[PDB]
Amino acid sequence: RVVQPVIVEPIASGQGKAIKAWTGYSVSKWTASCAAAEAKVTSAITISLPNELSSERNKQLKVGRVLLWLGLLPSVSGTVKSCVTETQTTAAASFQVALAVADNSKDVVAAMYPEAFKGITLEQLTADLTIYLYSSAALTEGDVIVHLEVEHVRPTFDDSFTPVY
Amino acid sequence: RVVQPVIVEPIASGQGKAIKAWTGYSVSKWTASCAAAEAKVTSAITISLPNELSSERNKQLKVGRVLLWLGLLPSVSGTVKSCVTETQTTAAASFQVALAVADNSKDVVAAMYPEAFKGITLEQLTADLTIYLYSSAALTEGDVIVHLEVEHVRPTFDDSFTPVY
Amino acid sequence: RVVQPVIVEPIASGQGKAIKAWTGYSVSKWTASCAAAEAKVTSAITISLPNELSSERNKQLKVGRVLLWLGLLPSVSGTVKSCVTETQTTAAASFQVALAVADNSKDVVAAMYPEAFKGITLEQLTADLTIYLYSSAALTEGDVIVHLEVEHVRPTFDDSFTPV
Amino acid sequence: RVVQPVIVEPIASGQGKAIKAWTGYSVSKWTASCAAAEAKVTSAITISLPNELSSERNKQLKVGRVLLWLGLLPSVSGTVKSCVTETQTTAAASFQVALAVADNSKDVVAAMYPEAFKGITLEQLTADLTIYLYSSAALTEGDVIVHLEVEHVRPTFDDSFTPV
Amino acid sequence: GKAIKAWTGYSVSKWTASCAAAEAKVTSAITISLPNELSSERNKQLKVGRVLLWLGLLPSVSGTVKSCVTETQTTAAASFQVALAVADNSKDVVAAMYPEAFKGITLEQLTADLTIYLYSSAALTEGDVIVHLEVEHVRPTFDDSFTPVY
Amino acid sequence: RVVQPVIVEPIASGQGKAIKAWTGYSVSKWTASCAAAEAKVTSAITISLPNELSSERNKQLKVGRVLLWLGLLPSVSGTVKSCVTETQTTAAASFQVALAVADNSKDVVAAMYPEAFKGITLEQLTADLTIYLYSSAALTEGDVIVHLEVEHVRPTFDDSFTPV
Amino acid sequence: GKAIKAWTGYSVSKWTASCAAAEAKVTSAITISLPNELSSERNKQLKVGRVLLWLGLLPSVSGTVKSCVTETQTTAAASFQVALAVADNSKDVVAAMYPEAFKGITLEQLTADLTIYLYSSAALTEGDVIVHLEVEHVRPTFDDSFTPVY
CB F148 within 8 A of CB F63: no
Cα F7 off chain centre by? 33
Q: Of C17, C33, C74, which Cα lies nearest the Cα of E149?
A: C17
What's the rounded Cα separation, in Å, for the pair A51 and A94?
Answer: 27
> CB distance from F159 to chain G under 8 Å?
yes
Q: Would you call D4 and B6 a contact, using CB atoms and an 8 Å cutoff?
A: no
Chains G and E touch (3+ CB pairs under 8 A): yes
Render D146-157 in DSSP notation, one character per residue: EEEEEEEEPPSG
Give residue numbers after which chain B breaks (C–N above 2.5 Å): none
Pairing of strands B4-8, D6-8: parallel
Q: Which residues 6+ apart lie within 8 Å of D162 measured at CB?
A: none
What was the elucidation method?
cryo-EM
- Quick one: which of D28, D139, D26, D128 has its CA closest to D82? D139
Contact indicator for F57, E101 with CB cutoff of 8 Å:
yes
Task: Quote the CA–CA distance of B55 and A16 in Å, as a whole number.
Answer: 22
Residue F92, SS3?
helix
How far is the C-alpha of E79 from the C-alpha of E70, rounded, in Å?
6
Backbone torsions φ then ψ of C95, nearest 5 degrees:
-70, -20
Decide: C148 and C34 in contact? Cβ < 8 Å.
Answer: no
* DSSP E strands, A73-128: 80-86, 102-103, 110-113
Q: Nearest 5°: CA angle at B93, between B87 and B98?
A: 70
Instruction: Tally the C-alpha atoms within 13 A of residue F138's C-alpha that lie toward its C-beta.
Output: 3
In this complex, the chains that touch E, judged by 3 or more CB pairs closer than 8 A, are B, C, F, G
Under 8 Å between Cβ of F137 and A40: no
Whose CA is closest to A127, among A35, A55, A59, A36? A59
Task: Decide if G143 contacts G16 (C-beta within 8 A).
Answer: no
| Contact status, residue G148 vs residue A15, Cβ threshold 8 Å | no
**CB nearest to B162's CB, from A51, A65, A69:** A69
Q: For residue F45, what are the β-bridge partners?
A: F131
> Residue C37: phi, psi to the nearest 5?
-155, 150
Say which residues have a Cβ less than 8 Å from residue A89's Cβ, sequence separation at least 6: none
C68 CB-side CA count, 13 A? 27
B24: number of CA atoms within 13 Å, CB side? 5
For C72, D156, F69, G20, G104, the CA distances from G73, given in Å and listed in that order, are: 75, 102, 43, 18, 21
Q: Distance between CA atoms of G19 and G100, rounded to whole angstroms?
A: 26
Whether residue B159 lies within 8 A of chain A, CB to CB, comes out as: yes
Pair B44, B35: CB distance under 8 Å: no
Q: How far apart are the first and last CA of chain E?
A: 48
Contact C154, C58 (CB under 8 A): no
Q: CA–CA separation, B113 vs B67, rounded Å? A: 6
Distance of CA B152 to the CA centre of its chain: 13
- Beta bridge partners, E118, equal E28, E67
D120–A163 CB contact, under 8 Å: no
CB G137 within 8 A of CB G8: no
If one counts every other C-beta atom within 10 angstroms of the C-beta of residue E123, the result is 13
Instruction: Quote the CA–CA distance of F60 and F121 in Å, as a whole number.
Output: 5
What's phi and psi for C78, nearest 5 deg?
A: 85, -175
Q: Cβ contact (<8 Å) for F7 and A5?
A: yes
- The CA–CA distances, whole Å, from G131 to F16, F50, G18, G69 equal 41, 18, 6, 11
Chains F and A touch (3+ CB pairs under 8 A): yes
Q: Which of F34, F40, F30, F1 is nearest to F125 (CA)?
A: F30
C-alpha distance from E2 to closest chain C C-alpha (Å):
6
Question: How many CA atoms lie within 13 Å of C135's alpha carbon, on the beta-carbon side?
Answer: 23
Phi, psi angles (nearest 5°) of residue E132? -105, 125
Compute the distance between CA of residue F146 and CA of residue F37 in angstroms, rounded to an integer: 15
In this complex, the residue of A6, A73, A145 whose CB is nearest that of residue F8 is A6
Dist. CA F48–CA G35, nearest whole Å: 15
List Cα–Cα distances, A155 to A62, A63, B15, in angstroms. 10, 12, 21
CA distance E48 to E32: 14
Q: Pick the closest to residue A146 from A62, A63, A80 (CA basis).
A: A80
Report the sign of the C-alpha dihedral through residues B46, B51, B53, B55, in that order: positive
At position B51, the amino acid (one-letter code) is N
C75 touching B (Cβ < 8 Å): yes
B20 touches chain D (CB under 8 A): no
CB F107: neighbour CB atoms within 10 A?
A: 9
Q: How far is CA F149 from CA E149, F27, F117, G37, G43, in A?
A: 53, 6, 13, 11, 16
Separation in Å, CA of E55 to nearest CA in chain G:
16
Please indicate if any CB of chain A lies within 8 Å of the CB of F38: no
Could you give the C-alpha distances from B48 to A55, B146, D87, F121, in angstroms and in order?
20, 12, 26, 22
At E125, phi and psi to the nearest 5?
Answer: -80, 150
> What's the length of chain D?
164
Contact with chain G for residue F160, Cβ under 8 A: yes
- CA B141/CA C136 separation, integer angstroms: 34
Are the beta carbons of E51 and E26 closer than 8 angstroms? no
The Cα F16–Cα C65 span in angstroms is 69
The rounded distance, in Å, linking the Cα atoms of A14 and C95 is 73
CA atoms C88, C94, C98, C100: torsion sign: positive
CB–CB of C49/C59 below 8 Å? yes
Residue of chain G minimizing CA distance to A14: G149
> From the CB of residue D150, how many other CB atoms can be counted at a distance below 10 Å?
28
Residue C111 to residue C103: CA distance in whole angstroms:
8
Q: How far is CA E123 from CA C66, E25, E118, E129, in A?
A: 47, 7, 12, 11
Say whether B16 and C10 touch across the interface (CB within 8 A).
yes
Q: Comparing C-alpha atoms, which of F123, A69, E134 is closest to residue C159?
A: E134
Tell me the CB-side half-sphere exposure of residue C72, using CA atoms within 13 A: 23
Nearest to F31 by CA among F11, F46, F44: F46
User: Coil, strand or helix: which one is E125?
Assistant: coil
Q: Where are the alpha helices (H) located in C28-132, listed in sequence order?
A: 94-97, 122-128
DSSP code at position G83: -
- Quick check: helix, strand or coil at residue F96? helix
- H-helix or E-strand spanning residue G81: helix G79-82
User: What's chain B's length in residues?
Assistant: 165
Task: Tell me the C-alpha distance between G19 and G122, whole Å.
Answer: 13
Breaks in chain G listed by the residue before each, with C–N > 2.5 Å: none
Partner residues linked to F103 by β-bridges: F81
> Cα(A40)–Cα(A137) distance, rounded to whole angstroms?
6
The helix or strand, by DSSP H or E, that contains position E13, with its residue range, turns out to be strand E10-18
Query: Are F35 and F158 within 8 A, CB to CB?
Result: no
Give ∠ CA B32-B33-B34 in degrees, rounded to 5: 115
Q: Which of A81, C11, A114, E105 is nearest to B18 (CA)?
A: C11
- The DSSP output letter for G26 is -
Q: Taking CA atoms, what residue in B is nearest to F85?
A: B56
State the first-to-last Cα distance of chain B, in angstroms, to the nearest integer.
Answer: 73
The helices-and-strands tally (H runs, E runs) of chain A is: 2, 9
Residues of E in contact with B117 (CB under 8 A): 41-42
φ and ψ of D117, to 5 deg: -110, 10
Enumerate residues 6+ apart whose C-beta is below 8 A from G126: G18, G19, G20, G21
The pair phi, psi for residue G17, each rounded to 5°, is -130, 130
Strand partners, A46: A130
Nearest partner of A81 among A64, A96, A65, A62, judged by Cα: A96
Is residue E136 less than 8 Å (CB to CB) from chain G?
no
What is the rounded CA–CA span in Å between residue E101 and residue E49?
9
Is E105 within 8 Å of F60 when comparing Cβ atoms? yes
Nearest to residue D9, comparing CAs of C6, C77, B108?
Answer: C6
- Which residues is G69 bridged to in the sheet? G116
Using a CB-CB cut-off of 8 Å, the residues of chain A touching C10 are: 163-165
Q: In terms of CA atoms, which chain F residue is nearest residue B164?
A: F99
SS (H, E, C) chain B: CCCEEEEECCCCECCCCCCECCCCEEEEEEEEECCCECCCCEEEEECCCCHHHCCCCHHHCEEEEEEEEEEECCCCCCCEEEEEEECCCCHHHHHHHCCCCEECCCCCCEEEECCCCCCCEHHHHHHHEEEEEEECCCECCCCEEEEEEEEEECCCHHHECCCCC
- Closest chain E residue to F158, measured at CA: E100
Measured distance CA(A34)–CA(A146) in Å, rounded: 7
Pairing of strands C102-103, C42-46: unpaired
Instruction: Please indicate if any CB of chain F lies within 8 Å of the CB of G74.
Output: no
Q: What is the C-alpha to C-alpha distance for residues B142 and B83, in angstroms, rounded to an integer?
A: 18
Is B17's Cβ below 8 Å from some Cβ in D? no
- d(CA D75, CA D77) in angstroms, rounded, equals 6
DSSP F86: E
The residue type at A89: T
- Residue from A138, A132, A120, A126 nearest A63 by CA: A120
Contact assessment for residue C149 and residue C29, using Cβ atoms and an 8 Å cutoff: yes
Q: How far apart are CA D137 and CA C21, in angstroms?
A: 53
Contact E107, E45 (CB under 8 A): yes
Distance from CA of A163 to the nearest CA of B (A): 5
Cα distance from B41 to chain E (closest Cα, Å)?
A: 25
* Strand ranges (E), chain C: 4-6, 25-33, 42-46, 63-72, 80-86, 102-103, 110-113, 129-135, 144-153
Residue whose C-alpha is closest to residue C26's, from C68, C69, C70, C65: C65
DSSP per position, D97-151: H-S--EETTSSS-EEEESSTTTT-BHHHHHHHEEEEEEESS-B-TTSEEEEEEEE
E136: left (phi over 0), alpha (psi -120 to 50) or beta: beta
Of B154, B139, B158, B152, nearest to B32 by C-alpha is: B139
Sequence letter at residue E110? L
Contact A165 B11 (CB under 8 A): yes
* Residue burial C131-148, b: 16+ Cβ < 10 Å; e: rest: bbbbbeeebeeebbbbbb
Residues with Cβ within 8 Å of residue G55, at least 6 apart in sequence: G65, G67, G87, G89, G94, G95, G129, G130, G131, G132
Using the beta-carbon criterion (under 8 Å), do B10 and D93 form an inter-chain contact?
Answer: no
Q: What is the DSSP letter of C99?
A: S
